[PDB]
């Protein structure tokens, strides 16, 4: 396999306006097909990057900037990862929009999945109303990232290499003094199956095909042999023995990881989805499902000289292996200060999410279900209603609910919302042949109340197997159309994702 740590890691540059004044922020940002090396023993790899880049610049931006973003496809109008036709029903082949994930946005520019539009806006998608896309940013600094939301082609663009990160600055956090600068570095981490030419490689079909399968056919999962951070296999960065600031954002399609660090050595978590927890977390380890993020201090201060594994215990298809998908990446403390470490690592963040005290307005019961197709392949379902089915979860704009999640299946899913951070109540487990057979709730445990890394805002969350997971979210600022899903892109392309209104009565 590839030699791991030999390539530096790239450190995406920050995106630079095309026009800027006080009142607004003016971004282009043109989808690109490019070639790039992943690794030192790679031929160039064709991919599709925003500016032509893998990962996209990354974007910077102040609390209430008045940010626009003109997003523009000019892509080729043939796909190079396998098209599955059967599983939506003129058309271009390509289409493209961009989702803002964490985004306190106005529906019209969250990227609804129906917004699409192919090269130079020739065709756009029946909900498409914008070229250019607002950001208020009028909400908590943190990590947030952009990726394609392309109705049923998501997991096909992103893995193609559609993904940024997009970085919410409060200057009221700046008198924390965190790691700042070059000590602030995003992680974007996606796992790729490359060929020995140097292609990606995306299953055209399940291993060992039914006959009965369509060609290509949809995979209800995928699991690559190699990882990349910020578009290197398995890279090493050079740090000061000092205290680092990483954006952790998990940009892969089905991979969940399990970060902790070789030597032993704690991280400090000092965010979550929806930005700073209340208080830090001194962490051995910790999960990261697909678009979850983590904001996490590392202070190397006591590890000059060394070389020290970001490692992986999370199997994707089977148990990891400690040559492949067990490592991440490599930091080596061998970088000459080049001024004292000024950064602190404080306890103090941030207001504590449970001193708002909303009136829960409705409590929705949600399943994680689905069905089978004429083929014989899984439909994953929400409530088992189709992406088309007419909406249902319609919250009132400025209302407080308890959704509950029901996952009788033997997977965890990673469900998000568009435009809300939650608050996550509690996990417990269930009896799940009896809710099969029944569709009686058997609670076989107490319920679990969330680990300090989810006391604080979280917009995508672990729902495990066998296990109710309630959270309260309040709806809005604004009013419209927006989606929830799992993001397990194979899951949400068939058809794991739903329609939700949020109504302004
Ligand atoms: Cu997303
Ligand atoms: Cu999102
Ligand atoms: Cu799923
Ligand atoms: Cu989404």
Same mark, same amino acid.
């Given at each position: ?19 800027? /004044? ?15 090396? @992943?690794?030192?023993? @790679? ?58 994930? #964490? ?11 129906? %917004? ?81 030419? #140097?292609?990606?490689? $995306? ?8 006959? /009965? ?43 969940? $990881? ?30 990261? %499902? ?35 998908? %067990? ?20 306890? $103090? ?85 009896? $809710? ?5 709730? /058997? ?21 495990? %197997? ?40």
């Amino acid at each position: 396999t590839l030699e791991k740590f030999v390539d530096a890691l790239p450190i995406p540059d920050t995106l630079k306006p095309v026009q800027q /004044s006080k009142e607004k922020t003016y971004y282009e940002v043109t989808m690109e097909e490019c070639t790039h090396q @992943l690794h030192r023993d @790679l031929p160039p790899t064709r991919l599709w990057g925003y500016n032509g880049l893998f990962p996209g610049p990354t974007i910077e931006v102040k609390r209430n900037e008045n940010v626009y973003v003109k997003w523009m496809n000019n892509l080729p109008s043939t796909h190079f990862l396998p098209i599955d036709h059967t599983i939506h029903h003129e058309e271009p082949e390509v289409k493209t929009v961009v989702h803002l994930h #964490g985004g306190v946005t106005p529906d019209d520019s969250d990227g609804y999945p129906e %917004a699409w539009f192919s090269k130079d806006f020739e065709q756009t998608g029946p909900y498409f109303k914008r070229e250019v896309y607002h950001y208020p940013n009028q909400q908590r600094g943190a990590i947030l990232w952009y990726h394609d939301h392309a109705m049923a082609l998501t997991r096909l663009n992103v893995y193609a290499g559609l993904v940024g990160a997009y970085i919410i600055h409060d200057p009221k956090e700046k008198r924390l003094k965190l790691p700042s600068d070059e000590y602030d570095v995003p992680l974007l981490i996606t796992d790729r199956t490359i060929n020995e030419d #140097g292609s990606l490689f $995306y299953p055209s079909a399940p291993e060992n095909p039914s006959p /009965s399968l369509p060609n290509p056919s949809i995979v209800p999962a995928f699991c690559g042999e190699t990882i990349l951070v910020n578009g290197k296999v398995w890279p090493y960065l050079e740090v000061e023995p000092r205290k680092y600031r990483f954006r952790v954002i998990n940009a892969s399609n089905t991979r969940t $990881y399990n970060l902790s660090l070789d030597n032993g050595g704690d991280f400090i978590q000092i965010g979550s989805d929806g930005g700073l927890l209340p208080r830090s977390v001194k962490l051995n380890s910790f999960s990261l %499902a697909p678009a979850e993020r983590y904001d996490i201090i590392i202070d190397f201060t006591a590890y000059e000289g060394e070389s020290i594994i970001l490692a992986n215990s999370a199997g994707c298809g089977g148990d990891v292996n400690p040559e492949t998908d %067990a490592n991440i990446m490599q930091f080596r403390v061998t970088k000459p200060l080049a001024q004292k470490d000024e950064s602190r690592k404080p306890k $103090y963040l941030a207001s504590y999410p449970s001193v708002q005290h909303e009136r829960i307005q409705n409590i929705r019961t949600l399943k994680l279900a689905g069905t089978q197709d004429e083929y014989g392949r899984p439909v994953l379902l929400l409530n088992n209603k189709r992406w088309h089915d007419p909406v249902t979860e319609t919250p009132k704009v400025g209302t407080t609910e308890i959704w509950s999640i029901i996952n009788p299946t033997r997977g965890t899913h990673p469900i998000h919302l568009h435009l809300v951070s939650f608050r996550v109540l509690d996990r417990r487990p269930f009896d799940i042949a009896r $809710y099969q057979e029944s569709g009686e709730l /058997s609670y076989t445990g107490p319920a679990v109340p969330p680990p300090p890394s989810e006391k604080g805002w979280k917009d995508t969350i672990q729902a495990h %197997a066998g296990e109710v997971l309630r959270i309260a979210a309040t709806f809005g600022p604004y009013s419209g159309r927006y989606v929830w899903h799992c993001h397990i892109l194979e899951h949400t392309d068939y058809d794991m994702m739903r329609p939700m209104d949020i109504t302004d009565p």
